[PDB]
Amino acid sequence: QTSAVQQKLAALEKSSGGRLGVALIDTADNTQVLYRGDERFPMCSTSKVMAAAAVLKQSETQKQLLNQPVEIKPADLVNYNPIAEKHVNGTMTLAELSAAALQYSDNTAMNKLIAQLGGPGGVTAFARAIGDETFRLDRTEPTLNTAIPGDPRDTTTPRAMAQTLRQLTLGHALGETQRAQLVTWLKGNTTGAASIRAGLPTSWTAGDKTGSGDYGTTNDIAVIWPQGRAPLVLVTYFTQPQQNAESRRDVLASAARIIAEGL
Numbered sequence: 001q002t003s004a005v006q007q008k009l010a011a012l013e014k015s016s017g018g019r020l021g022v023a024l025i026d027t028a029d030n031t032q033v034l035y036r037g038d039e040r041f042p043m044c045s046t047s048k049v050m051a052a053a054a055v056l057k058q059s060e061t062q063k064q065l066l067n068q069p070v071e072i073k074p075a076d077l078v079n080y081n082p083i084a085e086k087h088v089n090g091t092m093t094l095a096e097l098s099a100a101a102l103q104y105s106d107n108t109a110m111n112k113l114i115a116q117l118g119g120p121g122g123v124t125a126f127a128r129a130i131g132d133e134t135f136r137l138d139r140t141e142p143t144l145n146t147a148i149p150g151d152p153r154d155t156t157t158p159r160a161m162a163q164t165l166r167q168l169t170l171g172h173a174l175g176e177t178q179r180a181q182l183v184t185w186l187k188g189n190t191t192g193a194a195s196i197r198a199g200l201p202t203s204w205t206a207g208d209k210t211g212s213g214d215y216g217t218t219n220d221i222a223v224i225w226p227q228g229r230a231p232l233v234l235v236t237y238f239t240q241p242q243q244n245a246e247s248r249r250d251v252l253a254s255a256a257r258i259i260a261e262g263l
């Protein structure tokens with residue numbers, strides 16, 4: 001069946017020029033709203049959540065892991081390094097790298113998290129360990145953002161990512177301390193005000209991780225605490241036919257607004 005919300009999302013998609021994927025989990029009743037929920041989309045920087053979570057999981061059996069230094073060399077810098085560039089020829093801890101990756105979308109920081117996990121496949125292995133059979137990380141930054149239509153590398157589905165984000169932030173995929181840390185990091189994101197959050201009532205609170213890449217790929221994944229409601233998990237993925245297409249964070253805001261008004 002096609003719901004009123006799905007019909008509205010289809011109209012938004014039609015006017016957008018691109019391809020839109022949405023998955024909502026409302027933890028008030030565990031119900032879901034999906035739009036292209038089982039189609040693959042390039043994750044781009046939203047994959048930073050899985051990498052940070054995997055390191056948090058490792059830290060459950062190593063009390064000092066988040067304080068472990070990682071050398072940052074000039075050669076390690078990639079295309080977007082707002083935090084790591086400050087610490088070149090020195091070190092950053094795994095906690096610092098996690099915060100930089102999540103809250104500033106630092107790509108050097110992401111690469112250090114991936115290396116700590118033994119490469120992209122280590123991130124995928126963690127996904128499988130927490131019940132996500134769909135997620136795949138194949139490459140490091142920046143090439144994981146090529147976002148080529150039809151390319152399965154570095155993709156997931158909206159349904160899978162919403163379920164995983166729920167398990168990580170609200171469920172028991174991580175220990176309590178680690179779950180709280182992940183939520184704290186997400187709630188301190190600096191990059192999200194124009195994306196999902198822009199479509200939500202101001203009274204609501206949220207944590208999120210944005211992503212963007214080639215083909216005008218514009219993504220956001222969020223955990224949301226609505227005023228007077230149980231939390232929501234919302235994934236919005238968007239990608240366009242031309243390699244050099246511009247970002248469309250407004251489309252994600254519009255999708256979130258449709259979802260919010262449909263509650």
Ligand SMILES: CCc1c(C)[nH]n(-c2nnn[nH]2)c1=O
Pocket residue numbers: 044045079080105107145191209210211212213214
């Ligand atoms: C490397 C610069 C960059 C890309 C390609 N995407 N992205 C981003 N968008 N939303 N969150 N991170 C960025 O900050």
